[PDB]
Design an enzyme around this catalytic site. Structure first.
Site, PDB file in Angstrom:
ATOM      1  N   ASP A  44      14.223  77.415  34.319  1.00  0.00           N
ATOM      2  CA  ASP A  44      12.644  77.301  34.123  1.00  0.00           C
ATOM      3  C   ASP A  44      12.220  75.979  33.873  1.00  0.00           C
ATOM      4  OD1 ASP A  44      10.048  79.229  33.786  1.00  0.00           O
ATOM      5  OD2 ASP A  44      10.175  77.847  31.987  1.00  0.00           O
ATOM      6  N   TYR A  49       6.238  69.396  31.143  1.00  0.00           N
ATOM      7  CA  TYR A  49       7.626  69.241  30.362  1.00  0.00           C
ATOM      8  C   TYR A  49       7.974  67.816  30.316  1.00  0.00           C
ATOM      9  CZ  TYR A  49       7.496  74.368  30.207  1.00  0.00           C
ATOM     10  OH  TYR A  49       7.289  75.730  30.176  1.00  0.00           O
ATOM     11  N   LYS A  78       5.924  75.201  37.435  1.00  0.00           N
ATOM     12  CA  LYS A  78       4.659  75.818  37.278  1.00  0.00           C
ATOM     13  C   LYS A  78       3.383  74.475  37.476  1.00  0.00           C
ATOM     14  CE  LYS A  78       6.717  78.054  33.286  1.00  0.00           C
ATOM     15  NZ  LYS A  78       7.724  76.754  33.058  1.00  0.00           N
ATOM     16  N   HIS A 111       0.495  77.511  35.294  1.00  0.00           N
ATOM     17  CA  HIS A 111       1.021  77.684  34.191  1.00  0.00           C
ATOM     18  C   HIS A 111       0.181  78.427  32.967  1.00  0.00           C
ATOM     19  CE1 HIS A 111       3.825  74.980  31.618  1.00  0.00           C
ATOM     20  NE2 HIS A 111       3.725  76.293  30.731  1.00  0.00           N
TER      21      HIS A 111
HETATM   22  N1  LIG Z   1       4.920  79.747  30.264  1.00  0.00           N
HETATM   23  C1  LIG Z   1       4.697  79.011  29.270  1.00  0.00           C
HETATM   24  O1  LIG Z   1       3.606  78.432  28.959  1.00  0.00           O
HETATM   25  C2  LIG Z   1       5.995  78.708  28.472  1.00  0.00           C
HETATM   26  C3  LIG Z   1       5.617  78.579  27.067  1.00  0.00           C
HETATM   27  C4  LIG Z   1       6.866  78.465  26.228  1.00  0.00           C
HETATM   28  C5  LIG Z   1       8.062  78.583  26.625  1.00  0.00           C
HETATM   29  N2  LIG Z   1       8.324  78.621  27.899  1.00  0.00           N
HETATM   30  C6  LIG Z   1       9.600  78.559  28.609  1.00  0.00           C
HETATM   31  O2  LIG Z   1      10.351  79.414  27.846  1.00  0.00           O
HETATM   32  C7  LIG Z   1      11.450  78.652  27.254  1.00  0.00           C
HETATM   33  C8  LIG Z   1      12.038  79.221  26.000  1.00  0.00           C
HETATM   34  O3  LIG Z   1      11.202  79.136  25.046  1.00  0.00           O
HETATM   35  P1  LIG Z   1      11.130  78.025  23.939  1.00  0.00           P
HETATM   36  O4  LIG Z   1      11.878  76.852  24.601  1.00  0.00           O
HETATM   37  O5  LIG Z   1       9.765  77.989  23.620  1.00  0.00           O
HETATM   38  O6  LIG Z   1      12.148  78.553  22.817  1.00  0.00           O
HETATM   39  P2  LIG Z   1      13.308  79.498  22.659  1.00  0.00           P
HETATM   40  O7  LIG Z   1      14.114  79.950  23.766  1.00  0.00           O
HETATM   41  O8  LIG Z   1      12.902  80.861  21.830  1.00  0.00           O
HETATM   42  O9  LIG Z   1      13.944  78.732  21.457  1.00  0.00           O
HETATM   43  C9  LIG Z   1      14.700  77.608  21.829  1.00  0.00           C
HETATM   44  C10 LIG Z   1      15.134  76.941  20.496  1.00  0.00           C
HETATM   45  O10 LIG Z   1      16.331  77.897  19.930  1.00  0.00           O
HETATM   46  C11 LIG Z   1      17.395  76.930  19.701  1.00  0.00           C
HETATM   47  N3  LIG Z   1      18.490  77.934  20.015  1.00  0.00           N
HETATM   48  C12 LIG Z   1      18.898  78.234  21.262  1.00  0.00           C
HETATM   49  N4  LIG Z   1      19.967  79.005  21.458  1.00  0.00           N
HETATM   50  C13 LIG Z   1      20.206  79.400  20.232  1.00  0.00           C
HETATM   51  C14 LIG Z   1      21.274  80.062  19.775  1.00  0.00           C
HETATM   52  N5  LIG Z   1      22.156  80.759  20.379  1.00  0.00           N
HETATM   53  N6  LIG Z   1      21.569  80.016  18.121  1.00  0.00           N
HETATM   54  C15 LIG Z   1      20.405  79.208  17.516  1.00  0.00           C
HETATM   55  N7  LIG Z   1      19.374  78.505  17.936  1.00  0.00           N
HETATM   56  C16 LIG Z   1      19.393  78.472  19.580  1.00  0.00           C
HETATM   57  C17 LIG Z   1      17.229  75.697  20.510  1.00  0.00           C
HETATM   58  O11 LIG Z   1      17.922  74.899  19.985  1.00  0.00           O
HETATM   59  P3  LIG Z   1      18.792  73.586  20.767  1.00  0.00           P
HETATM   60  O12 LIG Z   1      18.066  73.674  22.243  1.00  0.00           O
HETATM   61  O13 LIG Z   1      18.775  72.479  19.970  1.00  0.00           O
HETATM   62  O14 LIG Z   1      20.320  74.248  20.859  1.00  0.00           O
HETATM   63  C18 LIG Z   1      15.737  75.381  20.288  1.00  0.00           C
HETATM   64  O15 LIG Z   1      15.329  74.883  19.226  1.00  0.00           O
HETATM   65  C19 LIG Z   1      11.056  77.164  27.336  1.00  0.00           C
HETATM   66  O16 LIG Z   1      11.943  76.070  27.160  1.00  0.00           O
HETATM   67  C20 LIG Z   1      10.177  76.961  28.694  1.00  0.00           C
HETATM   68  O17 LIG Z   1      11.004  76.869  29.724  1.00  0.00           O
HETATM   69  C21 LIG Z   1       7.231  78.504  28.922  1.00  0.00           C
END
Ligand SMILES: NC(=O)c1ccc[n+]([C@@H]2O[C@H](COP(=O)([O-])OP(=O)(O)OC[C@H]3O[C@@H](n4cnc5c(N)ncnc54)[C@H](OP(=O)(O)O)[C@@H]3O)[C@@H](O)[C@H]2O)c1
Length: 316
Positions: A44, A49, A78, A111
């Site tokens: 994704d 980004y 997006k 997006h």
């Molecule tokens: N469409 C939209 O508007 C939108 C908005 C937000 C997010 N997204 C997408 O969704 C994805 C995921 O959401 P997100 O990035 O907000 O957050 P998330 O996936 O909920 O959390 C990511 C965080 O969790 C940590 N982490 C990952 N795996 C872990 C594990 N097994 N144990 C402990 N900590 C862990 C990561 O650390 P490290 O990386 O340091 O390991 C990072 O700090 C985004 O990256 C993006 O691709 C889309």
């Protein structure tokens, strides 16, 4: 648990993907390489980004290495808010394709439903600090997305952060050519999204859950805020299943027929997060996790609440 979900364009989408928001550009190439090496087939991405070139380097190397074939990958990006004008959409898509070094995207999403004034700034501001909107509506932007399918640039189109009235507006569009394949929305035990999920699924739209771990690296986090990974109630379910809390948080949306896109740049966590095809949450576990809903959002686009198309004043 099957690995892919059938979309309303006839293609299959892997239910688990790698998120890339906030993945530093000097770490994301290795993150995506590791992900593909350990089984991920879905990445994704987004122009906003600012790391698509580096994501693309990884994809290209793994294709060159014949770790994977292009048909086996499912790459999502997006359209940013400053490109909703119909005439800017193709070029925005093409910049993403060029950066990711792809010939097509598997899925391209609007997006956010909010269009902003085009220009260099991703959040263009007036002198008083407000984000300057564009007048292009949600429906005209969708027609421009449909053209991308008809030109071969993308295999599927969809939406992100659309509320159900906004989803309905697209579904009811006069002359609609392609339904959205996906609505990508925030979803986790503190924002369970029952109403919007049921609506989308009832219409054949697949839902992708973003921030499934509660985005503990989000830029605006406070001390004060709830923490999924540290919630003792969730940790207990994990312990019962001999899995990590993150693995429970990833399995949860999978058992709701959702796609889920946890982000990591840590090799060990990338691998951990994929190892979610070896256990099942009970119905009681699922209902218990659903009970934690707080209507708490990582991503509330707080600078844009006066925008006409701001999505989060509606109940769902
Ligand atoms: N469409 C939209 O508007 C939108 C908005 C937000 C997010 N997204 C997408 O969704 C994805 C995921 O959401 P997100 O990035 O907000 O957050 P998330 O996936 O909920 O959390 C990511 C965080 O969790 C940590 N982490 C990952 N795996 C872990 C594990 N097994 N144990 C402990 N900590 C862990 C990561 O650390 P490290 O990386 O340091 O390991 C990072 O700090 C985004 O990256 C993006 O691709 C889309």
């Amino acid at each position: 648990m099957a690995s892919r979900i059938l979309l309303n364009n006839g293609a299959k989408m892997p239910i688990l993907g790698l998120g890339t928001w906030k993945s530093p550009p000097g770490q994301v190439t290795e993150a995506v390489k590791v992900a593909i090496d350990v089984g991920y087939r879905h990445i994704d991405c987004a122009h906003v980004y600012q790391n698509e070139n580096e994501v693309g380097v990884a994809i290209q190397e793994k294709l060159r290495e014949q770790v994977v074939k292009r048909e086996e990958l499912f790459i999502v990006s997006k359209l940013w808010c400053t490109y909703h004008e119909k005439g800017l959409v193709k070029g925005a898509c093409q910049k993403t394709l060029s950066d990711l070094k792809l010939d097509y995207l598997d899925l391209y999403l609007i997006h956010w439903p909010t269009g902003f004034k085009p220009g260099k700034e991703f959040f263009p501001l007036d002198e008083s600090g407000n984000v300057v909107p564009s007048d292009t509506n949600i429906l005209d932007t969708w027609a421009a997305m449909e053209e991308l399918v008809d030109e071969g640039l993308v295999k599927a189109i969809g939406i992100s952060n659309f509320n159900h009235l906004q989803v309905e507006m697209i579904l009811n569009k006069p002359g609609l050519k392609y339904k959205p394949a996906v609505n990508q929305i925030e979803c986790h035990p503190y924002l369970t999204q029952e109403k919007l999920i049921q609506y989308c699924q009832s219409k054949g739209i697949v839902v992708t859950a973003y921030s499934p771990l509660g985005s503990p690296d989000r830029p605006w986090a406070k001390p004060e805020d709830p923490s999924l990974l540290e919630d003792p109630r969730i940790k207990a379910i994990a312990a019962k299943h001999n899995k990590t809390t993150a693995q429970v948080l990833i399995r949860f949306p999978m058992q709701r027929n959702l796609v889920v896109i946890p982000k990591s740049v840590t090799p060990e966590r990338i691998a951990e997060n994929f190892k979610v095809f070896d256990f099942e949450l009970s119905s009681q576990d699922m209902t218990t996790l659903l009970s934690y809903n707080r209507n708490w959002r990582v991503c509330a686009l707080l600078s844009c609440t006066s925008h006409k198309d701001y999505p989060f004043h509606e109940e769902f």
